[PDB]
Symmetry: D3
Subunit: 147 residues, 6 copies
Amino acid sequence: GRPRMVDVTEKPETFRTATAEAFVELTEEALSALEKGGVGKGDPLVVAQLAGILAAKKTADLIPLCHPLPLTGVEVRVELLKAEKRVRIEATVKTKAETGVEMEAMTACAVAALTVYDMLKAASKGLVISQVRLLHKAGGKSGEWRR
Amino acid sequence: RPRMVDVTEKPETFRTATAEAFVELTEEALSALEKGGVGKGDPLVVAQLAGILAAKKTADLIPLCHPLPLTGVEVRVELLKAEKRVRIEATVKTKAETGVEMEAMTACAVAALTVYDMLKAASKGLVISQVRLLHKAGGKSGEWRRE
Amino acid sequence: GRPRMVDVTEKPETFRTATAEAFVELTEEALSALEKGGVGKGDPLVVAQLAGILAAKKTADLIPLCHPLPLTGVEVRVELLKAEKRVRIEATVKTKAETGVEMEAMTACAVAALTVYDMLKAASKGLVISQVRLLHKAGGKSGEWRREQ
Amino acid sequence: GRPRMVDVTEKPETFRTATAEAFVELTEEALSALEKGGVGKGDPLVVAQLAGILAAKKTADLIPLCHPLPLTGVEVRVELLKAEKRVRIEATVKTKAETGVEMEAMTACAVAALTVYDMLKAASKGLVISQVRLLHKAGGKSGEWRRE
Amino acid sequence: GRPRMVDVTEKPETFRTATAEAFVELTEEALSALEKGGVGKGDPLVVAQLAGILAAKKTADLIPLCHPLPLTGVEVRVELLKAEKRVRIEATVKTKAETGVEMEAMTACAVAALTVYDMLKAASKGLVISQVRLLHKAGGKSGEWRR
Amino acid sequence: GRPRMVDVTEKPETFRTATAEAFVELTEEALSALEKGGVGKGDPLVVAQLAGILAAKKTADLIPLCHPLPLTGVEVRVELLKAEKRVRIEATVKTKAETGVEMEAMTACAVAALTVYDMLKAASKGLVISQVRLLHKAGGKSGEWRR
């Protein structure tokens, strides 16, 4: 039960990929502010998308036992789903290492979601970040996985 | 256009914020948790500390967030066994020109992400169901609580 | 003669401001790619403007003897001066402290410029970052200062 | 279009190198202070040189879409060109990756220059970082490049 | 005398390992406080052990000429030696690279010790961190080494 | 008994100061290498001294429960005691806040010491950071403290 950064020293470096998603449920006030460009702090979706990419890179700094690794690819999508009154975020991270990047993809989505909140909380402090979850991951002995 | 809202001429006042997050556990993840984890250490203990650390790293993660001196940070991570859910709570305090809702939210989100990291070996399908604000005080808008 | 973070403990906290600017000189290819939305990595000016804001906050981490302090405001402007084949960056940082924020303003402009470079170098490695300089500052004993060139 | 960290996952790893330079224009006051050891904060060049090395390592944290990667070599040189009233900085960075290290070299020079400014601004607030530019780079598919 | 990182691009890639230790000598007051769970800030040994792992990962940021390296393994142990009135910290870091990880091991122990101090200084500000030293290292031109 | 950033919200901002020291025990081969400028990585003391100043600023990022504070002053001294075959390091940190800066001073000394080690590690891997201890602190309710 003692914390440790699992010893992965003898494992081979293989191509890893991970995809996660997250949602931000909007209020009428927030949705209205969004379609108008935000609350004066700038474009919520634009800032949040970049925050996601930055977050993927800062993952090892935020998750204690997470292994530091060279990321080879980061894609982040932040879109407004009007009819549903919520923002959907998706992130796919890739690398060539001995451990997966599910943490990088999950963190990217979570931070992108927190940034959406920060960019809109002036309109409504009740916004909720919901369903941060993994959708896909490949590489590693356990192979392919998809929700 | 993005910007760190100018709060230079706002008075410093006591501010507090409380948020929460949940992590949906699978049967396998609960089993592992009850047995001490998957081998990386106690999930809840590492997650609780990650949350405090995250509160301090908020301005670095949220683009337009103001860097401020925190005066207090509390984080609680508890397993709700029957519900197969981990509940995370965080309260942040300060005396500044801007609120600490982002610090509280970020603390809960990162603690949730860490719970994921500490158990994903048992189940990749773990879900961070939600992250939301519960209360905030201080500032112009005064008191706010979730209904 | 040895390095030190100047002691300003007994100095009164006051409203401070600093404004700086920087330029990135473009090649015709760079300008062309820029006008077309970038080189495939995204909008150069949008990413650079955000990078500048983040840079301001990380200033104490990059400049050894810089004092860590709470910034209360950060504005960054990144714009294309087509006719001049130049990208101009401007940044104004503010705080309430015992020391000025000239470094934050300068760093914000420098990093924004480096990001513009990063966002267009695939088109031209020759892009040049030029004239990173202070334009104005106020607050503190020295009082107000402005570049009159 | 949309910002992204270019996917280089399937690109062969190769030796990578990049060299850049930067200059800081000095006033008579700043130069005079530099020669006497600084303004009281310490040796401007010594502190800036170290800042540059540290900045090369922090590059991925400063440039949004930059690829994080281990660096195997970092060299930074800070020299005073007295008669010209200029401080020159040069940095060379090396590694083995799927992308170049042009940014690390550029950033190392820029931050070193910013530090020179910090170490001397007490003497003159008008000091200018005139230029920051690449001089050389090798590695990858496009081979070598050198400034004119 | 010009500070210059060592170019290791020209060096053999091998498995590297380093082990270091450090001690925190306790006053009766601190020992007493430690045996009761701390001074009200939390379990000193638990927080310090995690701090050690986090520090290992931040080594390149703290030591000027240290090379950024992906770490494949980090183990940290912080134990109370009651009879001797002191806490012993040990850390072992592993990787596959062109340079050793002696600094990561040393830094892990030093920051864990500093954290033990932070968690108990409320009881005694006179606590002393002593003997941060290397115990073993293998890989590299100099071959295996043991204190 | 869980970890927490002690609430200091109601405490006034006051002038705070703290001074600490550390020593690095030098072997014969390390003392000579030092006197001639080092082992090829540059001046051990010059690099270590600046490393100490930087470390003071990064203290909140290294010590989990440490409060992020604005620093108003940092002095670091690295000196060789030829007669004792020892390197003495001293650091003083100052600020105006609701909590002390003893951790900043201790950390500056510890990292400076680690850097002296890094800068001479080539000559002798057996060098030891003998001690790291607080010498003085003032400000706060408990008043002045002297070792």
